[PDB]
């Protein structure tokens, strides 16, 4: 029964880890899109 609580612990842990990874991924996406747009318009 304690292993269920262990499961819930690690589930909450990587829930938070996945949301932080989503924020990192969104900021990288936006930086790539901005770089490509700004460099596309220079010509």
């Amino acid at each position: 029964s304690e292993e269920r609580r262990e499961i819930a612990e690690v589930n909450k842990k990587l829930k938070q880890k996945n949301q932080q990874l989503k924020q990192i991924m969104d900021q990288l996406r936006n930086l790539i899109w901005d770089i490509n747009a700004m460099l596309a318009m220079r010509n």
């Binding site: 880890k17 990192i24 900021q27 990288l28 936006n30 930086l31 901005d34 220079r42």
Partner: protein
């Protein structure tokens, strides 16, 4: 007297009375835009590194 007479002669040869419509503005403008692109990318990299430090910090 020789140097100043020679330079007044040379200035007589290359004077026009017209205000020289050439410039270098566009290249400075493009260089400023390139530098501000670099600055924008620097600020964004600081933000991504800060979120990575928040993730690894726990």
């Amino acid at each position: 007297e020789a140097e100043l007479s020679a330079q007044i002669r040379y200035l007589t040869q290359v004077a026009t009375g017209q205000p020289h419509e050439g410039s270098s503005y566009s290249s400075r403008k493009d260089c400023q835009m390139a530098l501000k692109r670099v600055d924008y990318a620097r600020l964004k990299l600081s933000d991504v590194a800060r979120t990575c430090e928040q993730m690894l910090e726990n």
